[PDB]
Structures are given as C-alpha cells and as structure tokens.
C-alpha cells in the first residue's frame, strides 16, 4: 500500500479560490500560514524532534513514499494545493471538504505548527494540539501547536468516538512517520472521497486525550 500524490484542481481559478478560503480562515484565527514544522524560542528545539525517542519505535517512511511527499510539497510551493475547501459550519466551526476527487491512499497534508514540549502545554487551551513524539520520559514528549502558525490540517474535523454510527464518517487517517530520523505527522485518505465530502479522521488514534462526546 503506497502513498499517492493528490490531483490539484485543473482550473487555476478553482485553486486560487481554494487557497483563498484557507487564507480567510487563518486570518480569522489571526494565524500565519506555515507548511512546515516550526521551532520557536521558549519552545522545543529541532534537536528534540528525534523519532528514536518514540516509546516502542516509529515506522519509517520509505524512499518511495518520501519521494511522493516531496512532490506534494513541491506542488504546494508552486500553487498546486490539494483540492480542499475550508468552510464554516455552524455546528462544527471551520471544516475541510473535498473540492475535487481524492482517491484512497492519497496524501492530503502534513500537520504543521509550532513544535513544543507537552510539559509546556499542560494548561494550554488551544483546540488543535496534535501529538508529535511520545517518549518514555514525559518531559521529552512533543506536541504540534498550530495556534500562531499552521496549515489546512488544523481545520480538519474529527469523529465522535462515542456514538454507534460515528465511526462511519471517517474517510481519512492521521499517521506519524520517521523522516530523516525526525517525527512527522501526515493525513492520508482511507477511501475514495467525492467532491463536497467533508473530511473526518479519528482525533484519538493512539491516546484518548481529545473529548469528542458532543461532536456531530
């Protein structure tokens, strides 16, 4: 099972419209766009992000999958974003929906933001923290914090983990891979997604640190 590159919307106007909805939502949260993990002052240094610290080890991204990742990254640099729309919903807030077809196993996005120690965010109110590294010594565990800087991944919805039919909405998955010895968080489609379909993954895919009882 191999990672697939996304297919950008063919109409350049559709791509600019898509990128506009993301810029609009970032502005609403007073955020700066950032398509990479950032290491800021008073937070974690890039040297703390080493996948060998992950308790029980971390799967390694293959050379073939790294190539695909690099293509998608290069596509986003020149304006070929994945076909995604950030859309406000009154019951979910900002959400992300496919604005074109996304095939099973397609790379959607990396979860970016500021890398920080979990120890430093025990009190933080940010609703979009994502585990990066879970170390045996908890003072070395890292979390991605897209509160000041981030990308589209922070807007993607999660499933209700408590309802009998909530699992049926999941159409993508968040996974952590070692890339050049560092931890990285990616989102991948787990079935074919149609245009207009809202994206949902399991926020509690390893720990159970996200309350979802009230999710729609």
């Amino acid at each position: 099972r191999r990672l697939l590159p996304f297919v950008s919307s063919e109409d350049p106007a559709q791509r600019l419209k898509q990128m506009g909805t993301l810029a609009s939502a970032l502005t609403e949260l007073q955020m700066e766009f950032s398509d990479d993990l950032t290491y800021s002052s008073g937070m974690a240094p890039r040297s703390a992000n080493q996948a060998r610290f992950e308790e029980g080890g971390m799967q390694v991204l293959t050379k073939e999958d790294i190539e695909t990742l690099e293509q998608c990254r290069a596509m986003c640099k020149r304006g070929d974003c994945p076909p995604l729309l950030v859309v406000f919903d009154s019951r979910e807030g900002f959400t992300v929906e496919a604005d074109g077809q996304i095939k099973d196993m397609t790379f959607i996005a990396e979860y970016t933001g500021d890398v920080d120690y979990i120890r430093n965010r025990e009190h933080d109110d940010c609703d979009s923290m994502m585990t990066l590294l879970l170390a045996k010594d908890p003072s070395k565990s890292l979390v991605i914090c897209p509160d000041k800087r981030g990308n589209i991944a922070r807007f993607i919805s999660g499933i209700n983990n408590h309802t009998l039919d909530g699992k049926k909405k999941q159409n993508c998955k968040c996974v952590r891979y070692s890339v050049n010895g560092e931890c990285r968080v990616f989102l991948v489609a787990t079935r074919d997604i149609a245009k207009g379909e809202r994206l949902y993954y399991d926020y509690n895919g390893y720990e159970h640190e996200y309350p979802t009882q009230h999710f729609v």
Binding site: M58, D127, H208
Partner: peptide, 14 residues
C-alpha cells in the same frame, strides 16, 4: 486541561 489529538506511530495507513 489540555485536549490533544493523537495518531499511531506503527501499523501504517491500512
């Protein structure tokens, strides 16, 4: 009290 999304480090995608 800190809500955190989390993802597995093994098992692949499918």
């Amino acid at each position: 009290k800190a809500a955190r999304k989390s993802a597995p480090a093994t098992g692949g995608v499918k």
